[PDB]
Amino acid sequence: MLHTLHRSPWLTDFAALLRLLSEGDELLLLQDGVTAAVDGNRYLESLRNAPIKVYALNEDLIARGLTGQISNDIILIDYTDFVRLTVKHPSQMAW
Amino acid sequence: MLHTLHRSPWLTDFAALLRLLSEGDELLLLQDGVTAAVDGNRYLESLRNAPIKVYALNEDLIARGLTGQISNDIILIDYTDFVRLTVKHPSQMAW
Amino acid sequence: MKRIAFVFSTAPHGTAAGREGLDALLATSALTDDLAVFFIADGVFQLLPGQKPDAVLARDYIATFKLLGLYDIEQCWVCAASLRERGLDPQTPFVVEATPLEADALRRELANYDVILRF
Amino acid sequence: MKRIAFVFSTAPHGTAAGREGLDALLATSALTDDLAVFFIADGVFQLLPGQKPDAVLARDYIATFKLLGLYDIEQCWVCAASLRERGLDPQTPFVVEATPLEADALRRELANYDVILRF
Amino acid sequence: GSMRFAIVVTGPAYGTQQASSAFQFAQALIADGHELSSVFFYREGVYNANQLTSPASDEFDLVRAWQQLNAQHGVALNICVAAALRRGVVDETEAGRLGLASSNLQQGFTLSGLGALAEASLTCDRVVQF
Amino acid sequence: GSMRFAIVVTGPAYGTQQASSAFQFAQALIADGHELSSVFFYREGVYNANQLTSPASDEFDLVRAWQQLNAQHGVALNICVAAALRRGVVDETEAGRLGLASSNLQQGFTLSGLGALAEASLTCDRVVQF
């Protein structure tokens, strides 16, 4: 299941989101969601301790001037990768 | 300063909201904000430990069927009281 | 064949998501029996009885949830963890016959669906 | 006489609040010198340099923040606590000359204003 | 006793409850003897002036409710022209300049600049944001 | 290799970034060899079909971008009629029945029922919600 977060983690029911993550799932941060990928932010640890791989849409990091402050644990992708990610997963849970 | 919260505490930057509360201020919960007034919810304690009085718009509790599950610490008011609350405070911070 | 899951995650009235989600749910039920409904996060508030939204000039669409029982939409679940965070009685007589599931179980059940539409 | 405070609390581009708030801020600056701008919560992200929103088809209104320095809108503050929660370098050369304030100080400063408009 | 109020609406006629609570707030303050100088519609609030809004017969017609507030209590309903343009709410004159075949500004609403928001904030006793 | 996609847009043309990212996503999937069966506009997503939308000359004209996607790649742009009605987006025929003096449905968009959303979900390989 591909999980998508387009809102700021600070304005998201983050606990509810974590409870839906299962091993093998993947989380893509896009739009305002990419702020959760900033090195040192308070939501980063919970994501790292989650049994999944976390991605961040590069276009949105560029839009927000955050390209040089992303955690090494987060994978940078573009729209084409985003597409392939949706092809890879049969389902998508959008937050 | 009258603080107003119209969104669900779960979708609000609650930490940011608490940091703006000063002794003598008052917080009115309205619309989806009234969920923070439900007895036993996880945001209730932080509100109780805040140096302010917390109100909840009755009309919104009625709309959501929560009139009988409100904490005793929260003051129930109607629209007319809401108005007087805005007359009482020179400023309003809307969340 | 695709199985469709509808997930209600927002509180009622503050936003029209619940109303429009229920509308989408019912239209879909007419084209397939392979659908389920999940109430998670704030969406659990959709289930409370005695709601009277006309008080805030909002449509009383909660009544419409009755059609789930009427037209055999039986795969209904509610997040037990969410109800606890919100201080809601797990024994509350919800307007929908949703059986509570713990985090792990709800998660596994949702993973059985091909499409997830969140409201 | 009323003192007006503009508070930016949302991140840029995801929502148009920052853009429309900056527009309101500038129009108001033309009618009074008694105004201040506060960047709190996600609004601190409004201050980052090098933003290129055209990448996501959004307007580059950040450039417009330059007019605050140009037209004497000097009462500008940024929440130090917020920057820390977001892992942002407090020494970052913001696009606005906002001086950092700790929770208590920022709170007291904001209480000096008659009107608060949040974006 | 009586205070001069200015209300700011930032939510749509239908979609969120903000505009509805602001309307119920307006009725309450007027009923309590206060004066509602004006209501400024900005951001998604401009949709409250979309004349084509068509609620079901059993749903509250907020757009006309606003019109009625202007007609009955003389409350000025100011809509930010720029915010309205970006969201497709224009009056006949603007449609003519833009070459559009029609318009949709609800009678009772007044297109205006942000200067009207600033002026209300500087001169009214209270400003309440919805 | 090629997959059948259905995209769901729930955000406005201007106001949030959802509709914009969905558009950039659509271009990317089509460019990657996949097929975009249709885009369903629901909730605030219906504003993407508001013909009167008037962005500044230096701002992206998303409404026409959608029209162009339909014209160039034959992608069906389905708008929920009921959601559109509640938010003031109607076509000429609906305006006639409602007694309205004008309409604002952008050419290229198709009014439809929720049945089109369900059908896309049941028959497409993937459904991506924005």
Chain centre to alpha carbon of residue D29: 14
Distance from C-alpha of A40 to C-alpha of A74, rounded to nearest angstrom: 12
Sign (positive or negative) of CA dihedral A20, B30, B92, B21? negative
**CATH number listed for the domain at residues A1-95:** 3.40.1260.10
Quote the CA–CA distance of C102 and A19 in Å, as a whole number. 10
CB contact under 8 A, D117 and E121: yes
Alpha carbons B67 and B5: distance in angstroms, whole number: 18
What secondary structure does DSSP assign to E28-52, as a single string?
HHHHTT-EEEEEEE-GGGGGGGBTT
- Write the Ramachandran bin of C8: left for phi over 0, alpha for psi from -120 to 50, otherwise beta: beta
Nearest residue to D56 via CA among E63, A64, C39: A64
The answer to whether F77 and F110 are in contact (CB under 8 A) is: yes
From the list F47, F62, F40, C61, the residue with the least C-alpha distance to E53 is F47
Closest CA to C36 of C111, C93, C91: C111
CA distances from D58 to B19, D19, D45, E116, F16 (A): 31, 10, 15, 27, 10
Return d(Cα C37, Cα C43) in angstroms, integer: 11
DSSP state of D98: P
**How far apart (Å, rounded) are the C-alpha atoms in residues A53 and D56?**
24
Size of interface D-F (CB pairs under 8 A): 24
Find the residue in D nearest to B25 (Cα). Answer: D111
Write phi, then psi, for A58 (nearest 5 degrees): -55, -40
Phi and psi dihedrals of C110, rounded to 5?
-65, -30
Positions of E marked active-site: 80
Nearest chain E Cα to F10, which residue? E15
Between CA D119 and CA D107 the distance in angstroms is 17
Considering only CB atoms, A19 lies closest to which of C7, C107, C113, namely: C107
- Among A4, A6, A11, A13, which would you mutate to test the C interface (most chain C Cβ atoms within 10 Å of its Cβ)? A13
State which residues form the domain around C65: 1-119
Q: What is the DSSP string of D4-55?
A: EEEEE-S-TTTBTHHHHHHHHHHHHHTT-S-EEEEE-GGGGGGG-TT--GGG
> Is residue B29 helix, strand or coil?
strand
Tell me the technique behind this structure.
X-ray
Report how far residue B30's alpha carbon sits from residue C45's, in angstroms, rounded to the nearest whole number: 15
- Among F49, F27, F32, CA closest to F40: F49
Q: What's the longest Cα–Cα distance across chain E?
A: 50
**Which tokens sit at B16?**
């940011």
Residue with tokens 């939308």: F53
Q: What is the CATH number of the domain that holds C64?
A: 3.40.1260.10
> Which residue in E81, E78, E85, E84 sits closest to E41, CA to CA?
E78
CA E48/CA E19 separation, integer angstroms: 8
What's the CA dihedral at E114, E115, E118, E124 to 10 degrees? -120
Residue with the two structure tokens 């003051």: B75
Going by the DSSP 8-state scheme, the letter that residue F55 receives in this structure is -
**Number of CB pairs, chain B paired with chain C, less than 8 A apart:** 68
DSSP string, E75-89: -EEEEEHHHHHHTT-
CA distance B66 to B68: 6
Backbone dihedral region of F114: left (phi > 0), alpha (psi from -120 to 50 degrees) or beta? alpha
CB distance E59 to E68 below 8 Å:
no
Element containing residue E127 per DSSP (H, E): strand E126-129
Residue type, E64: R
Picking from B7, B40, B64, the nearest residue to C45 by CB comes out as B64
**D contact test, residue of B91, B92, B95 with most D CBs within 10 A:** B91
Residue count of chain C, please give it: 119
Query: What are the phi and psi torsion angles at B53 (to 5°)?
Result: -100, 135
- Residue contact F87–E47, C-beta within 8 A: yes
Which among D118, D112, D99 has a CA at the least distance from the CA of D3? D112
The one-character DSSP state at C16 is T
The helix/strand/coil state of C75 is coil
Q: Contact at 8 Å (CB) between D82 and A35?
A: no
Q: Which two tokens stand for residue C53?
A: 């939204």
Integer-rounded Cα Rg, in Å, for chain E is 14
Is A61:A36 a contact under the CB 8 Å cutoff? no
Distances from the Cα of E21 to the Cαs of B76, B83, E16, E27, in angstroms? 16, 12, 10, 10
User: Residue C62 phi/psi, 5° resolution?
Assistant: -60, -40
Which residues, 6 or more positions from B50, have their beta carbon under 8 angstroms from its beta carbon? B18, B21, B27
C77 DSSP β-pair partners: C38, C99
Longest CA–CA span in chain C (Å) reads 43
Q: Residues C19, C39, F13, E60: what is their CA dihedral angle, to the nearest 10 degrees?
A: 20
DSSP state of E106: P
How many whole angstroms separate alpha carbon A34 and alpha carbon D51?
14
Integer angstrom CA distances of residue F89 from D42, F12, F76, F81: 33, 12, 18, 8
- E111's enclosing H/E stretch is strand E109-112
The answer to whether the CB atoms of C42 and B11 lie below 8 A apart is yes
The alpha-carbon gap from B66 to the nearest alpha carbon of chain D, in Å, equals 29
Report the catalytic residues of F.
Answer: 80
CATH number of F1-130: 3.40.1260.10
Q: C78-84: list long-range contacts, CB under 8 Å, 24+ apart.
A: C78/C38, C78/C39, C78/C40, C78/C44, C78/C47, C79/A16, C79/A19, C79/C38, C79/C39, C79/C40, C79/C41, C79/C44, C79/C103, C79/C106, C80/C106, C81/A19, C82/A16, C82/C39, C82/C40, C82/C41, C82/C42, C82/C43, C82/C44, C83/C44
Q: How far A16 CA lies from chain D's nearest CA (Å)? A: 20
Residue given tokens 């060899």 in the structure block: F33
- Whether C35 and C25 have beta carbons less than 8 Å apart is answered as yes
* Sequence spans of domains, chain B: 1-95
Q: Would you state the structure tokens that stand for residue F20, as one six-digit string?
A: 């914009």
Is any Cβ of chain B less than 8 angstroms from the Cβ of D110? yes
Question: CA B73 to CA D9: how far, in whole Å?
Answer: 29
Report the amino acid identity of residue A36.
A
Resolution in A: 2.2
Length of chain A: 95
Position C19: which residue type? R
Q: For chain C, how far is it from start to end, CA to CA, in angstroms?
A: 23
Quote the CA–CA distance of D75 and D93 in Å, as a whole number: 17
Q: In total, how many domains does chain D have?
A: 1
How far is it, in rounded angstroms, from Cα A49 to Cα A70?
Answer: 17
DSSP character at residue E68: H
What residues does F62 pair with on adjacent strands?
A: none
- Best interface-test mutation with E: which of C57, C59, C64 has the largest number of E CBs within 10 A? C57
Contact: F62, D57; criterion CB under 8 Å: yes
Give exposure, A15-32, as e/b (b: 16+ Cβ within 10 Å).
Answer: ebbbbbbbeebbbbbbbb
DSSP A7: S
Q: Do F21 and A6 touch (CB under 8 A)?
A: yes
Question: Which pair of structure tokens corresponds to residue A52?
Answer: 């999944």
Place of tokens 């713990």: C102
DSSP alpha helix (H) spans, F74-127: 81-86, 92-98, 115-123
C-alpha C76: how far from chain center: 7
Measure CA F71 to chain center.
Answer: 13
Please choose, from the candidates F78, F77, F75, F79, the residue with its C-alpha nearest in 3D space to the C-alpha of residue F35: F75
Residue of B nearest to C53 (CA): B63
φ/ψ (deg, to 5) at E117? -75, -45
- F73/F62 Cα distance (integer angstroms): 16
Quote the tokens at residue E105.
């500004």
Contact of E75 with E26, CB cutoff 8 Å = yes
**Cβ within 8 Å, pair C52-B62:** yes
Closest alpha carbon to F77 in F9, F3, F2: F9
Q: Decide if C101 contacts C84 (C-beta within 8 A).
A: no
Backbone angles phi, psi at F79, to 5 degrees: -110, 125
Q: Which residues does A12 contact at the CB level (< 8 Å), separation at least 6?
A: A5, A95, B11
How far is Cα C47 from Cα C11, in angstroms, rounded to an integer? 10
Which residues are within 8 A (CB) of D24 and not within 5 positions of it... i.e. 6 or more apart?
Answer: D6, D117, D119, E42, E114, E117, E118
Whether the CB-CB separation of F32 and F88 falls below 8 Å is answered with no
